[PDB]
Motif scaffolding. Sequence first.
Motif, PDB file in Angstrom:
ATOM      1  N   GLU A   5      28.424 -50.239  73.339  1.00 33.76           N
ATOM      2  CA  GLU A   5      28.588 -51.218  72.267  1.00 33.76           C
ATOM      3  C   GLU A   5      28.311 -50.464  70.967  1.00 33.76           C
ATOM      4  OE1 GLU A   5      25.849 -53.035  70.604  1.00 33.76           O
ATOM      5  OE2 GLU A   5      26.952 -54.731  69.752  1.00 33.76           O
ATOM      6  N   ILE A   6      29.321 -50.361  70.109  1.00 31.29           N
ATOM      7  CA  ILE A   6      29.321 -49.411  69.004  1.00 31.29           C
ATOM      8  C   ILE A   6      29.527 -50.169  67.705  1.00 31.29           C
ATOM      9  CG2 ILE A   6      30.347 -47.326  68.080  1.00 31.29           C
ATOM     10  CD1 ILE A   6      31.575 -47.179  71.085  1.00 31.29           C
ATOM     11  N   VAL A   7      28.530 -50.132  66.833  1.00 31.33           N
ATOM     12  CA  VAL A   7      28.620 -50.728  65.508  1.00 31.33           C
ATOM     13  C   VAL A   7      28.574 -49.606  64.490  1.00 31.33           C
ATOM     14  CG1 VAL A   7      27.615 -52.320  63.866  1.00 31.33           C
ATOM     15  CG2 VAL A   7      27.494 -52.814  66.291  1.00 31.33           C
ATOM     16  N   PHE A   8      29.646 -49.443  63.725  1.00 31.84           N
ATOM     17  CA  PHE A   8      29.629 -48.383  62.733  1.00 31.84           C
ATOM     18  C   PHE A   8      30.160 -48.894  61.407  1.00 31.84           C
ATOM     19  CE2 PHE A   8      34.138 -47.287  62.614  1.00 31.84           C
ATOM     20  CZ  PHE A   8      34.581 -47.837  63.795  1.00 31.84           C
ATOM     21  N   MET A   9      29.457 -48.536  60.342  1.00 32.98           N
ATOM     22  CA  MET A   9      29.868 -48.827  58.982  1.00 32.98           C
ATOM     23  C   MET A   9      30.641 -47.645  58.418  1.00 32.98           C
ATOM     24  SD  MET A   9      26.451 -50.531  57.427  1.00 32.98           S
ATOM     25  CE  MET A   9      25.143 -49.700  58.301  1.00 32.98           C
ATOM     26  N   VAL A  10      31.480 -47.932  57.438  1.00 38.86           N
ATOM     27  CA  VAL A  10      32.331 -46.927  56.823  1.00 38.86           C
ATOM     28  C   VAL A  10      32.365 -47.170  55.320  1.00 38.86           C
ATOM     29  CG1 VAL A  10      34.364 -48.307  57.291  1.00 38.86           C
ATOM     30  CG2 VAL A  10      34.641 -45.875  56.856  1.00 38.86           C
ATOM     31  N   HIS A  11      32.594 -46.082  54.587  1.00 36.55           N
ATOM     32  CA  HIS A  11      32.649 -46.091  53.132  1.00 36.55           C
ATOM     33  C   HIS A  11      33.602 -47.170  52.636  1.00 36.55           C
ATOM     34  CE1 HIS A  11      32.427 -43.923  49.174  1.00 36.55           C
ATOM     35  NE2 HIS A  11      31.277 -43.539  49.695  1.00 36.55           N
ATOM     36  N   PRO A  12      33.219 -47.960  51.637  1.00 38.40           N
ATOM     37  CA  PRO A  12      34.106 -49.032  51.176  1.00 38.40           C
ATOM     38  C   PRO A  12      35.161 -48.534  50.204  1.00 38.40           C
ATOM     39  CG  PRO A  12      32.091 -49.102  49.936  1.00 38.40           C
ATOM     40  CD  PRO A  12      31.957 -47.932  50.880  1.00 38.40           C
ATOM     41  N   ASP A  13      35.705 -47.360  50.485  1.00 37.75           N
ATOM     42  CA  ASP A  13      36.938 -46.904  49.864  1.00 37.75           C
ATOM     43  C   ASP A  13      37.928 -46.356  50.871  1.00 37.75           C
ATOM     44  OD1 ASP A  13      35.476 -44.539  50.379  1.00 37.75           O
ATOM     45  OD2 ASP A  13      36.729 -43.479  48.920  1.00 37.75           O
ATOM     46  N   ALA A  57      29.087 -51.924  52.596  1.00 42.06           N
ATOM     47  CA  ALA A  57      29.824 -51.052  53.499  1.00 42.06           C
ATOM     48  C   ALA A  57      30.868 -51.859  54.266  1.00 42.06           C
ATOM     49  CB  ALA A  57      28.872 -50.339  54.455  1.00 42.06           C
ATOM     50  N   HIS A  58      31.576 -51.209  55.190  1.00 43.77           N
ATOM     51  CA  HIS A  58      32.582 -51.894  55.997  1.00 43.77           C
ATOM     52  C   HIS A  58      32.261 -51.706  57.473  1.00 43.77           C
ATOM     53  CE1 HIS A  58      37.123 -52.363  57.193  1.00 43.77           C
ATOM     54  NE2 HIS A  58      36.322 -53.178  57.853  1.00 43.77           N
ATOM     55  N   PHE A  78      32.050 -39.474  64.746  1.00 48.10           N
ATOM     56  CA  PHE A  78      31.324 -40.265  63.758  1.00 48.10           C
ATOM     57  C   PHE A  78      30.488 -39.376  62.849  1.00 48.10           C
ATOM     58  CE2 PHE A  78      31.222 -44.224  66.669  1.00 48.10           C
ATOM     59  CZ  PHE A  78      32.542 -44.453  66.367  1.00 48.10           C
ATOM     60  N   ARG A  79      29.813 -38.383  63.426  1.00 45.95           N
ATOM     61  CA  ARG A  79      28.958 -37.509  62.630  1.00 45.95           C
ATOM     62  C   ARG A  79      29.778 -36.662  61.667  1.00 45.95           C
ATOM     63  NH1 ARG A  79      24.230 -35.099  64.211  1.00 45.95           N
ATOM     64  NH2 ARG A  79      24.662 -36.154  66.200  1.00 45.95           N
ATOM     65  N   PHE A  80      30.733 -35.898  62.193  1.00 44.67           N
ATOM     66  CA  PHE A  80      31.498 -34.964  61.383  1.00 44.67           C
ATOM     67  C   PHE A  80      32.505 -35.646  60.474  1.00 44.67           C
ATOM     68  CE2 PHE A  80      30.253 -32.134  64.934  1.00 44.67           C
ATOM     69  CZ  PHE A  80      29.543 -31.232  64.175  1.00 44.67           C
ATOM     70  N   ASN A  81      32.716 -36.948  60.627  1.00 47.99           N
ATOM     71  CA  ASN A  81      33.555 -37.702  59.713  1.00 47.99           C
ATOM     72  C   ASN A  81      32.720 -38.193  58.539  1.00 47.99           C
ATOM     73  OD1 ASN A  81      35.688 -38.981  58.578  1.00 47.99           O
ATOM     74  ND2 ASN A  81      35.923 -40.538  60.175  1.00 47.99           N
ATOM     75  N   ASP A  82      33.247 -38.003  57.334  1.00 52.40           N
ATOM     76  CA  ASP A  82      32.479 -38.233  56.119  1.00 52.40           C
ATOM     77  C   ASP A  82      32.412 -39.695  55.715  1.00 52.40           C
ATOM     78  OD1 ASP A  82      32.831 -35.552  56.417  1.00 52.40           O
ATOM     79  OD2 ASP A  82      33.614 -35.181  54.402  1.00 52.40           O
ATOM     80  N   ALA A  83      33.382 -40.504  56.126  1.00 50.22           N
ATOM     81  CA  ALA A  83      33.402 -41.908  55.753  1.00 50.22           C
ATOM     82  C   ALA A  83      32.549 -42.768  56.669  1.00 50.22           C
ATOM     83  CB  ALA A  83      34.837 -42.432  55.753  1.00 50.22           C
ATOM     84  N   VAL A  84      32.413 -42.384  57.937  1.00 45.82           N
ATOM     85  CA  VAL A  84      31.621 -43.169  58.874  1.00 45.82           C
ATOM     86  C   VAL A  84      30.154 -43.073  58.485  1.00 45.82           C
ATOM     87  CG1 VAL A  84      30.996 -43.519  61.251  1.00 45.82           C
ATOM     88  CG2 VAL A  84      33.301 -42.828  60.671  1.00 45.82           C
TER      89      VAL A  84
END
Lengths: 100, 116, 88, 271, 65, 65
Positions: A5-13, A57-58, A78-84
């Motif tokens: 069960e994965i909840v992740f926020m991402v940059h709001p751009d 966030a998103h 998720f880690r190496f991605n800058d928006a996550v």
Amino acid sequence: MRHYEIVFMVHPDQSEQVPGMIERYTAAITGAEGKIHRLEDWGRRQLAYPINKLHKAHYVLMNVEAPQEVIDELETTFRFNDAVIRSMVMRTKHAVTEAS
Amino acid sequence: RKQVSDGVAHIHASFNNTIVTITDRQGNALGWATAGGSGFRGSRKSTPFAAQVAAERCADAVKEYGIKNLEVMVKGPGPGRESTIRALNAAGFRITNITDVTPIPHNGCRPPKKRR
Amino acid sequence: SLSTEATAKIVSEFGRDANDTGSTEVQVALLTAQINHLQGHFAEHKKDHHSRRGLLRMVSQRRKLLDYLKRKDVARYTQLIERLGLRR
Amino acid sequence: AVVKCKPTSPGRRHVVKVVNPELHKGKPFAPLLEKNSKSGGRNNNGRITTRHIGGGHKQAYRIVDFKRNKDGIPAVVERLEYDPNRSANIALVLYKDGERRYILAPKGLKAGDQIQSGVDAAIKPGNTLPMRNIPVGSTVHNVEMKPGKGGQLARSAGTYVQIVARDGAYVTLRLRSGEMRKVEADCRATLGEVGNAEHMLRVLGKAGAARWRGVRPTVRGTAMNPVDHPHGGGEGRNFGKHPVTPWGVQTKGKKTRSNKRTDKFIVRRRS
Amino acid sequence: IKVRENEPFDVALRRFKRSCEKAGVLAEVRRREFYEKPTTERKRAKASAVKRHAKKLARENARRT
Amino acid sequence: FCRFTAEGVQEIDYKDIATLKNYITESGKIVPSRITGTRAKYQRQLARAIKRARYLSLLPYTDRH
RNA sequence: CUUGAGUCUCGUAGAGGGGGGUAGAAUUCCAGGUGUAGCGGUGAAAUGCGUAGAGAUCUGGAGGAAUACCGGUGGCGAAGGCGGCCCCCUGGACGAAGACUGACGCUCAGGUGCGAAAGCGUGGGGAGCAAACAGGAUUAGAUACCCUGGUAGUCCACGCCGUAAACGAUGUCGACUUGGAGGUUGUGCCCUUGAGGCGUGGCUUCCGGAGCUAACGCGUUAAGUCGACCGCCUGGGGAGUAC
Ligand SMILES: [Mg+2]
Ligand SMILES: [Mg+2]
Ligand SMILES: [Mg+2]
Ligand SMILES: [Mg+2]
Ligand SMILES: [Mg+2]
Ligand SMILES: [Mg+2]
Ligand SMILES: [Mg+2]
Ligand SMILES: [Mg+2]
Ligand SMILES: [Mg+2]
Ligand SMILES: [Mg+2]
Ligand SMILES: [Mg+2]
Ligand SMILES: [Mg+2]
Ligand SMILES: [Mg+2]
Ligand SMILES: [Mg+2]
Ligand SMILES: [Mg+2]
Ligand SMILES: [Mg+2]
Ligand SMILES: [Mg+2]
Ligand SMILES: [Mg+2]
């Protein structure tokens, strides 16, 4: 193949990139016969505390049933991605597709 | 010495001393006045009256700014955290809020050992 | 550990049948499978003393069952130790 | 591993060895070697310029690919090898086009590992890519100080540089000396720490060890005569002088960096 | 504890220094003052537990009042 | 009266911040079951849910961010 | 042979352990802004910090350590001990229903392993706290308490030590013998005609009956009534020292 069960926020751009994010990750999960159960893209939520000089966030919640190497490569993405921002994987051992 | 309306009256009330610094809404300090500078050296420094006097003496030197409404940020223990607010309002400042900004750790750093 | 499928496979392989799960051969085979498994866990988690305590309990349990099997029926004892890869 | 020799004789009693059982027990790769004649410390003029050098074992120079500028093409770490020039071990790798190259061996580099370089490479230890595609905070080695230069930081054994900040064109790096240096973000950096991280645990046992590593004896300044060294003289262990180099300059604390053209890069200096 | 201000001032300063003991801050910075060794932590907690066990169920006495 | 054993939620969802906010204070501290009733098992589930909500910033650790 | 002891199926709770990764609060330091004569500390002071601009306040960065609240005579663990969140590997415990092996059990000299803190070695790390140390006080003196600083150390990896008021001062295992109020974790049924009532298990806290005890007190988790095995004691010092 356990139930995560994965909840992740991402940059709001890169909120415009959350579709491609989601389908890319779910395709990677399905490639190893992982089964997506919930895919609730929560849209742009307002944060309770500012994460990296940034409110609002998103969120994306997704309940999957995939093997460990799949979920670990996913965590690395998720880690190496800058928006996550503030990903969170969790074990749930069931099939939860109800609400929220 | 330009005029500003929304200032914040930061209060570093402690056991020994109390410090009342009035800053604008971004943290640029206008003026400050402590209990130790108003006289009150030693045991007097740690009384509510000394903090009252310090808050009065800080309501001055900020008159050059025309401060009308104030956010009160009480930070720390000590007697001069509830008398300084009363003295700041008896100076003619409409208070907008009172917020405790005392640093509470979450079991962070280790305190000094103990007195004996 | 030693998931239901693996332990049931050992039961079926080492017992009278799949219902026969308490016999000495099956108990010893399950303990041996668990020990061979946990050797890998304790290969790197050398400082897992609390889990190694249970591992040593398993080792002593397997040895007590093997002694019982030996002084109860030596033929089954030899057959089990050679089929299981034991004796040092 | 770190192996302590048994005291079967003096000069063997105090030895501690680093036996790396994965090193190639054979002749190194031939086309990547070239001769490396000793100097003795003597410069163009024949005169000793740096003292305490001479002798030692013969050793051939292994052409190490410090640049790692073969982008996109994957590579398989064919072999780990002992390099007599470095403190770290080298790794002969084979690219998918048929070209063999020596690289520095990072910490997690065993035989058969799949590395590569380029802007699109992964973030596995051993993969070179400019320090823009590399996430901040990661541990890198073989860092370049100029784009395409070749890599000069964190290339000793067990050494690494850390990416602390990233401001536009430049990246701040905590070097192995605690100094924070700004290098432009086009400079490449291989990921992970350098291997042979236990190299600093050997203790060489005896004098002949240093002698065949190439280190001639060091005469203390006090053991000389006043004409030979600023220290010296004295009817039996007299010093009474401030410690200085054999040419008069203060030692035991005197900052001797005067560059004034690279100071724009040093955010903060060694501890 | 960001008590926004209503009109009468200690109609609101009262809910400031009454919320301060709801959040228990002016007494939370009395443990954080000095380091109380874990033995003393456990001992004080155990003594508070034993004191809480004051048998208020034993108050059916006459005492000639 | 533990309006969690009143229902048998069987797991306190950390995404149900609507009901999680019922168990914090204006400063974001968890409220003890010694006040909220909250049978101990569900109090433990509730604390874990509060902490996960804080991590995901669905709730605030404190009121001073 | 099955009433001991084990195995299997389902489930439950848990700071049980090992590895990895993150979160926030706070302390400190650094760079910058405002601003200014105090700060800090105490019984009182002083050392100390400060006009070279501190303290206070705001912004940004670094770094280390511990995880507020939940938190509970709560839980887990053989003991030591273990509390932010997440993942990976893993041990144990308990419950219901059944099958399964059939005494395979209890204890244990020697032996083996785990074993707080301090300490030791090598290599890192070092925010805070702080032995030693330095200064200021107190003092008859003060190599103390108190204040200001502050190094090992506390942290991490791997080794060594093997000791504590390592303590329920209560060895382990088993059986039996009135009760009361709880806590926690299971489980069956009934009106669930709610979160209730009625039972049945595991662990656990307090009070107390018989009995026991020199008394204090223990009191179904006995220090009661018995069985098995082990460890230990033989006046106080010398001395748990000497060799
Ligand atoms: Mg030399
Ligand atoms: Mg020398
Ligand atoms: Mg010499
Ligand atoms: Mg001479
Ligand atoms: Mg001379
Ligand atoms: Mg002479
Ligand atoms: Mg002489
Ligand atoms: Mg039978
Ligand atoms: Mg013994
Ligand atoms: Mg040990
Ligand atoms: Mg220690
Ligand atoms: Mg040490
Ligand atoms: Mg001190
Ligand atoms: Mg002892
Ligand atoms: Mg103890
Ligand atoms: Mg004893
Ligand atoms: Mg009693
Ligand atoms: Mg002795």
